[PDB]
Amino acid sequence: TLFQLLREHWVHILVPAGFVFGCYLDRKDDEKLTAFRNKSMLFQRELRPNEEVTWK
Amino acid sequence: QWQEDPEPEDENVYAKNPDFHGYDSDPVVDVWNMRAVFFFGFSIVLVFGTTFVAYVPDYRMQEWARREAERLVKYREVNGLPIMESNYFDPSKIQLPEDD
Amino acid sequence: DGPEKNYEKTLAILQIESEKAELRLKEQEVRRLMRARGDGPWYQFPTPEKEFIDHSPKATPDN
Amino acid sequence: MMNGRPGHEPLKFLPDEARSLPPPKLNDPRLVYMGLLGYCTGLMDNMLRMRPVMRAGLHRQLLFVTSFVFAGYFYLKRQNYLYAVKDHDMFGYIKLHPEDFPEKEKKTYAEILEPFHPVR
Amino acid sequence: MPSTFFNLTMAFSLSLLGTLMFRSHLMSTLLCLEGMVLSLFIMTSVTSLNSNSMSSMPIPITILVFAACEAAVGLALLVKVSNTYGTDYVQNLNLLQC
Amino acid sequence: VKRFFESYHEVPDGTQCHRKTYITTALGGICGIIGSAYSVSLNPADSTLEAVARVGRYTFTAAAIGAMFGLTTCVSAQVREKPDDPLNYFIGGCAGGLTLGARTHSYGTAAMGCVYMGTAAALFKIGKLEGWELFPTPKV
Amino acid sequence: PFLDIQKKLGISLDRHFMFLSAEQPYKNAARCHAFEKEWIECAHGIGGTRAK
Amino acid sequence: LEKTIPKSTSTLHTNMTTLTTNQKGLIKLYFMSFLINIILIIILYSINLE
Amino acid sequence: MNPITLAIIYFTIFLGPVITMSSTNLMLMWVGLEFSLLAIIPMLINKKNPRSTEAATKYFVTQATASMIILLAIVLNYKQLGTWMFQQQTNGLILNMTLMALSMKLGLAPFHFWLPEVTQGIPLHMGLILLTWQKIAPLSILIQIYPLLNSTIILMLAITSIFMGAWGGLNQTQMRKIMAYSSIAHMGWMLAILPYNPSLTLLNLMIYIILTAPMFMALMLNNSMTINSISLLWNKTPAMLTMISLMLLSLGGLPPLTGFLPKWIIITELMKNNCLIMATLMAMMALLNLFFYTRLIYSTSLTMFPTNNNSKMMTHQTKTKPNLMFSTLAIMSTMTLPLAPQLIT
Amino acid sequence: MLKIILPSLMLLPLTWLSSPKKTWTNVTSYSFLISLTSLTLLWQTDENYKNFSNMFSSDPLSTPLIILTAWLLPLMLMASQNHLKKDNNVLQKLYISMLISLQILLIMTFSATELIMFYILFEATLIPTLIIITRWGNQTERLNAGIYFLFYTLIGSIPLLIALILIQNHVGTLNLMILSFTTHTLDASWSNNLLWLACMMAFLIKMPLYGVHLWLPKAHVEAPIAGSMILAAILLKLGSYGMIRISIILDPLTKYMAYPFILLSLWGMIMTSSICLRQTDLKSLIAYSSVSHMALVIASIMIQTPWSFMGATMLMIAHGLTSSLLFCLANSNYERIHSRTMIMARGLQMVFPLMATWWLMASLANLALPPSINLMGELFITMSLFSWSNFTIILMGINIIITGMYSMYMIITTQRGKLTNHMINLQPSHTRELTLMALHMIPLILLTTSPKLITGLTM
Amino acid sequence: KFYVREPVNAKPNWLAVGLSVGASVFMWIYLIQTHNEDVLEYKRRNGLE
Known about the structure:
The structure is cut from a larger assembly and holds eleven protein chains of eleven kinds.
Chain G: H1 5-9, H2 33-42, H3 48-51
Chain H: H1 6-21, H2 27-48
Chain J: H1 2-16, H2 23-37, E1 50-51, E2 57-58, H3 62-79, H4 89-111, H5 115-124, H6 127-136, H7 142-171, H8 178-181, H9 190-206, H10 215-222, H11 225-235, H12 237-246, H13 259-275, H14 282-303, H15 306-337, H16 353-366, H17 373-388, H18 393-415, H19 431-449
Antiparallel strand pairs in J: 1-2
Helix pairs in contact in J: 1-2, 1-4, 2-3, 3-4, 3-11, 3-15, 4-5, 4-6, 5-7, 6-7, 7-9, 7-10, 9-12, 10-14, 11-15, 13-14, 13-18, 14-15, 14-17, 15-16, 15-17, 15-19, 16-18, 16-19
PDB class: oxidoreductase
Keywords: Inhibitor, Oxidoreductase
Entry title: Cryo-EM structure of mitochondrial complex I from Mus musculus inhibited by IACS-2858 at 3.0 A
């Protein structure tokens, strides 16, 4: 049977999906907090060419 | 005396299933719970996490501090300076009161 | 990706929290002064309305 | 306290001065938490009336979710307007009465004399 | 005017004192309430006539209206109490102590 | 009169002790009269004379409590020469609770009243020193 | 005031006869009319804290 | 420790409960107490501000 | 009761507080209060039993006295300064007697001895109304004159309401009196902050209402009126134990439930005005309030009291209740603290 | 942090939407995986602590506690399968949900940058714990135990809330990064002393102190095995974490407002370790040993020296592990005879030879057998105190003696001696509980191998 | 037939289903178009951004 194989065993996507979603939200926070990117008395350096960002 | 069921009788869980692991009365469930526990606890966590931690570099800046202390003692013995000044902050940076 | 990312995120977080603290204190002084001195625009308490007055010529002159 | 401020329209939900604010994303965590409240409300309704959960009254659950997200969006626009007006009033009053809100002119730790409290 | 208002206030206070200090009978307390209503009506009418404010005379008549409605429902409750216990005594409605 | 009850703070502790005693005794009598009123109106007595008895009982008890509190407080301020110490007021509240027990004939009430009234009086002294506000005006 | 329905619909059920300086029958005038008028006109647009 | 902290708090609060809530269900006495409160408030006001 | 009578009476109940809210003149606030207390009585006495009649009497007499006092206050503020609505230039005696009478009506301590009885003697759907809809108009009055109220009096009243509510509901077996004392305590909270900020007393009122209404609904589900009765829910309606427990723990003021928000944001706004002691005592006694809610949770959900041989029948049969609003309100009364900024201002 | 919390949430739908048979396996496995995911916090290659947002963070102090909290969940689930085997599916799911909520709230508390979130969650950890105790405990004292546990904590916490709000009104923020750089000496006054009391007594009641510790043994005795484990291992560490975080803003009032508490802790250590001798209940013995151990943490935190904080962190971690282990061991025999008395079953080395090695190793970790980390903490705390006053080692040493004494008494009168031949119901050991003891022990070996992780901010 | 006392909610009430679905989709559409119009009004009230 294929339905009885997926009526159960489909719950094995929740927790991994949650991990992915949490990583996404952490990236969103990092994006929000970009007001000192390459503007810190330490790590403030001149930018390389083709380097559009010091970090996302 | 009011109605209730009598206190049941303890059971020997090995009676019906001698190959019992302690998890569930249904054997298949028992075996697979055992296997998942063992796998995800010992084979996965206690091994891969242990390695991940053993290969964390410069934990809290410990190797770097050693290398730099070597650099500094070298420089300071080679240039006559002492190995540690009793004052962290250059007094020029400090303006003490004009106490009178 | 470290270690500059965490450093700079921390700097930004500190900016944010310090600004919010400053503003909370500013609010707690502004409300005080508005409620003591009556200046606007908060803590303005109502007064009788002025357009329900009869400005028409009355029956007696001294009114 | 803000009730008696100039321009206060009595019984006005969105005074049309709030259309200068950045409206809220529809995937805002608050709206998709109101959505969870709606879903859990459908679930508890099915539970109390002795109905299968997660499989009964799918229209009812959808309705709950939509209503919750709707009220959320609009109430949230209003609350944003309110907090913005609060900041507006505060900054305006500070500009008007500066002598009561002067600068800090803070010194550096070279001139400050903080005492030392040992640990012995 | 001032002595009149002082005496009417003292009268309201006496009727309130009566209402608060129950005796066996309930109708006496209802009558004390009506006396407070009377005092207040008179005070309001005197004030409106002393101020020549003929736009506030509609107020005391409303006072009387609502006071009499209160009296009516009080009399109905009194009827029910008497039916229950046979008397309008207050020492009989003391079973809600639990 | 409120100037009377404020005469308690016209001079620091260890001074005009008898005046402090009289003031605190009057305050205790006040509180006891309030409690006796509430205890005769509610939970009334079999007889008016018995109600007056209850009144006098509660009132004299409260007055004795206040007397001991104020007296011991000013005495400790006079002896160890620490007028600004909440510990004197703690001792005073403790003596007041020991009284409260003597009257009720209960060592448990004595201990509880001690450890509660002492705390309360010490906090009252702390509030008079550090300028607290019990019923403050709205200022924001 | 708590629910300013009147000020919303633009009606007057209870507010046109509050104070003495309001319209009276046959254009009579309650005594202290001018004093009340001036008090109200001074207290307008500033609040009850300043008006005091 | 049981006597001191928990089994003293419990006794205190249950006794104050017995006091407060063991009423007689008579409106006469409730209104007498209301009068007591009226008088107390008027006295507080008179002495504090007049 | 016929539909015409029901219409008139319920429309009057509704209209009463509306007039009070929507009116500038104090006299019309008074007539609104009177509409309310005249229309509510027949709904109490409908059952026609001695308990209902005496509840009606104790309610009517008290509310009439309080209304006469409020009317005296209005008439004195008319004799003085020749206007109806109060003003900054009004006698503190007038203002304070008005506050006292409004408390008398609301049922605050020490003017509370009538509310537990009046709520025990009547049915539950009326206790709901009594404790939720009839506490607004007074609060409207108080919120329109909050700058003028004395802080000493309201604060004494509030600490008294807290202490007495706790100590009284502590040893109650009947549920209606427990709800009465909960009302007393939460009204003490509502009132302790009114002069400083009345946008928070309205919040506490809304929250207490959405909290008590579904509790009353639960009680009305099986007409439960005692601890021993609700102890039988595990056999009759076990799907209600979760919501019951959560609403109780919220009413008590436990995080992470939105019954803690009023407590917290009131303590805050009080210490912004240096009322450390008041807020401290209030919280320490709200703990005692929580205690008997917890004992009740024990009795109902966290353990299983004995049942009867007949409840098997109730198990056989079906049930149409509750409605949709119970779940809605019970969810928006426990799981909404995350939205507190939206709730507070 | 979301990558550790959102999986812990989705665990709930995984618990409820799962077939009655596969509900335990799935949740256990994914909880193990989440414990794994939590190991990234140890990637600290600098002195700059990890700030993930304005709300979530993890320093060297919170990371060990977070990992322990994520690792204890599957162990609790396992331990909680022999009981609940006869309970309905919904009850099992509810138990698992309680445990998951506890995990989540604790990870939040340890990740929180602000003290109000910390307080809200510190208090939210009462609901699931109380439910577990009163709903799945076995005796009637469940209810009094839950009452004590609630109200000690709340009566302690309310002043803490008042003090946090006061600090907010005075400073503008309750953030922990800001309150550390923007700090000011606290003028010595009765007001600030009461502030100290308010800020401390909630945690001191949760560690706990000696004078207030009666809520702990009642709970542990009347709590099911999972509740006992989480309580002992984490819900006490909660108070120490709070004190360590909040003691920066109480300087220097901690210099002279500590003597009472240092003293009570040092003395109650002896008192409790002595109680652990004349104690019929094994669970009560474990609880009083926990109190004796947390007394050292309290004293250490009170003197606030680097060695002190380090020893306190090590002792917290090690005691959590070993106490969870001892409660597991006790419940093993309980499930056979259904009695908590340590005198009934006193020859169990002749039937359970392997399970006795777990008893031995635990009781060796309970006492300070080196190079265990249960010993390094005690040693560095002893050193810090000796530096404080050279007369502390007297009490420390008599506590050491009593500790060895009652641990040896436990294992002797429980395993060694003549077997109780009437105990025909002594089924052999379950693979599951054996895995439990193994999972409690091996991490102790690994930490002893790498102690740099559990030192703390001071090192 | 399994229930002697024929149940309520045995076969659905379709008016409620239709009304619920219609209200849901209408509220979603109203909300989305209103959000877009609000974005546009904000942008054009300040420099299209």
